[PDB]
């Protein structure tokens, strides 16, 4: 029922009881859950909600969580039944639990844990304790095609049956249609085909309480379960992956975006794991290692997904990987997995336990529903604000600086209606002056400055005029490393211009000032992950609530305003504040470029000279 104001009239379906203050939860019949942080039982309520409910928004006071079938399956896999969950919900809900949600929970939980998929002898078997369900699912035409059949076309005969590897991902989606999702259960201790590996945990590795909780939730009843864990950048996600690999003790596969990710993972493994270097191999296009005796293999998705003809040695390595059975597989940056080529890598690679790690999961193409079965349900997601309070990460000071558009640019901005319009607002002389003043202020404050600009031309022009190093497409790796080392070590240079390649193509050195000038066009998750990766915790300013500085230069009255508003929605859902700054104090006293309007006319001439080709 909907009121005239648009509010959903849930009063009738929610019988309120007199235990208002003690119970902190509101359970609307639509599936949403509201929690008050100031309640004394917030910690218990937070722990209960995280286990069973997927959070939507976590601002300072009231948090909103959502109930999903995948979340219910994850809760069942943890070991919680319907009765205890219902009891805890009723003990915490201010109003009575609607029967619609109750029936929703009853239907999902009963159907969970019925169908099991086993990978043995490089063969996939579907088996269950209820042959009636198996017999019923045989009638499905999609399941008939996915089921492996004999060389003569005859179908193969807790009875299990072989399933085609190429149709595994198809079967995963069909399970949703049949309402019988598969079970990602692995024999953590009962495994015998794959021997253990001489790899342990160094004493220098310390697991933070949330990391330990996430690992223990993943290891349901002592058995590793496939899933996805979301952690903020810089929170030792690589350390968590190394710890999980050491715990598994089986064959380990790790996939990164580029060779830099492979090198970072190898360094972390050497830093925390006890596996010998001879058992660590890099299947990269430049630095190659023999796959013989490769206990842990680190590679990239595109290397395994190279549809074009590969090198002869790479073909041999791929054959060995296909022949080899992998107890554990590790995937980094899950948000790029929904791509079809990278999804095909999952079919190509035969692995028992698959764990995915990333910082964000809100794809702009919303291709995450299928991702819930490509790997599994989201195992854990840490609260950014809570970790900021714990001091594990820097408490970032975020600000959006509005740079007025010059009237000459503004008229041309309105005149242009095609994609060439990006250059006009990305090259605002007023924005240039604001960026120059910010750089001067932070250099006088002795701060590390990273200027991110997606547009190659704008980034190059800004870096050249400001006389700072610039990083763009080619960026020869030797020169890139030299620039990174100069930024890390040389105090004279503390301002680095980085193009779009700064997201995942290489490692971002720890800094404190990050200024974003150019936008992708609405990448609400990509730039958020970039911001998380750029800024890390800095000692000395732990007591202050503003130890990391992020500024977003946005052109007023332009489409960049809408892009920024759409993008910052994800960070606002995390409780991150954003202050709008229209006037910058100190620009009047400081001397900046383009002080005269004729200089801005020259910049306009230069920008117009850069046609739509750039």
């Amino acid at each position: 029922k909907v009121d005239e104001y648009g509010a959903k009239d849930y009063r009738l379906q929610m019988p309120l009881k007199d235990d208002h203050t003690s119970r902190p939860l509101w359970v609307a019949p639509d599936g949403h859950i509201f929690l008050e942080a100031f309640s004394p039982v917030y910690k218990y309520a937070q722990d209960f909600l995280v286990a069973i409910a997927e959070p939507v928004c976590r601002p300072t006071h009231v948090h909103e969580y959502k109930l999903t079938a995948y979340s219910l399956y994850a809760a069942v896999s943890v070991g919680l039944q319907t009765s205890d969950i219902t009891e805890y919900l009723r003990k915490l809900s201010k109003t009575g639990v609607p029967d619609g949600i109750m029936q929703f929970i009853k239907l999902c939980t009963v159907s969970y844990g019925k169908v099991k998929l086993v990978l043995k002898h490089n063969r996939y078997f579907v088996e269950s304790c209820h042959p009636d369900v198996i017999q019923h699912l045989l009638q499905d035409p999609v399941i008939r095609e996915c089921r492996l059949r004999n060389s003569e076309g005859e179908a193969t005969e807790t009875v299990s049956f072989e399933v085609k590897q190429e149709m595994i991902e198809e079967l995963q989606k069909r399970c949703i249609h049949l309402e019988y999702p598969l079970l990602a259960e692995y024999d953590f201790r009962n495994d015998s085909v794959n021997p253990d590996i001489n790899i342990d945990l160094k004493p220098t590795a310390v697991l933070r309480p949330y990391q330990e909780k996430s690992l223990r939730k993943m290891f349901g009843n002592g058995r590793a379960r496939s899933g996805v864990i979301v952690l903020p950048c810089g929170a030792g996600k690589s350390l968590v992956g190394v710890t999980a690999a050491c715990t598994v003790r089986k064959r380990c596969l790790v996939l990164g975006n580029s060779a830099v990710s492979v090198e970072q993972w190898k360094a972390q493994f050497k830093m925390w794991s006890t596996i010998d270097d001879s058992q660590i191999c890099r299947f990269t296009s430049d630095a190659k290692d023999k796959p013989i005796g490769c206990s842990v293999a680190i590679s990239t998705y595109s290397m395994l997904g190279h549809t074009t003809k590969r090198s002869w040695e790479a073909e041999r390595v791929m054959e060995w990987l296909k022949t080899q059975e992998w107890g554990l597989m590790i995937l980094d940056e899950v948000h790029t997995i929904p791509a079809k080529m990278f999804r095909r890598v999952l079919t190509i690679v035969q692995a028992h336990c698959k764990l995915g790690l990333t910082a964000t999961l809100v794809r702009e193409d919303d291709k995450i529903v299928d991702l819930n079965f490509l790997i599994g349900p989201k195992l854990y997601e840490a609260n950014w604000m809570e970790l900021q309070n714990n001091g594990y990460i820097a408490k970032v000071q975020c600000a959006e600086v509005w740079c007025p558009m010059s009237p000459e640019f503004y008229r041309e901005y309105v005149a242009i209606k095609t994609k060439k319009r990006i250059l006009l607002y990305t090259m605002n002389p007023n924005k240039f002056r604001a960026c120059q003043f910010l750089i001067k202020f932070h250099e006088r404050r002795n701060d590390k400055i990273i200027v991110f600009a997606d547009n190659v031309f704008a980034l190059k022009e800004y870096a050249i005029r400001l006389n700072k190093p610039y990083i763009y497409g080619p960026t020869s790796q030797g020169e890139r490393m030299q620039i990174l080392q100069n930024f890390k070590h040389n105090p004279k240079i503390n301002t680095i211009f980085i193009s779009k390649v700064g997201d995942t193509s290489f490692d971002l050195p720890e800094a404190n000032v990050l200024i974003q000038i150019s936008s992708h066009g609405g990448s609400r998750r990509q730039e958020a992950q970039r911001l998380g990766r750029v800024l890390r915790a800095k000692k000395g300013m732990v007591a202050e609530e503003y130890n990391a500085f992020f500024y977003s230069l946005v052109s007023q009255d332009t489409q960049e305003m809408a892009y920024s508003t759409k993008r910052q929605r994800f960070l606002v859902d995390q409780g991150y504040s954003f202050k709008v700054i229209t006037k910058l104090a100190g620009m009047e006293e400081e001397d900046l470029a383009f002080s005269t309007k004729e200089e801005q006319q020259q910049l306009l001439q230069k920008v117009l000279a850069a046609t739509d080709l750039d």
């Binding site: 915490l92 290891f219 002592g222």
Partner: peptide, 15 residues
Amino acid sequence: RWEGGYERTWEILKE
């Protein structure tokens, strides 16, 4: 070796 099991169900109790 603490990964075997971990629950906070009893922490969710009326007081």
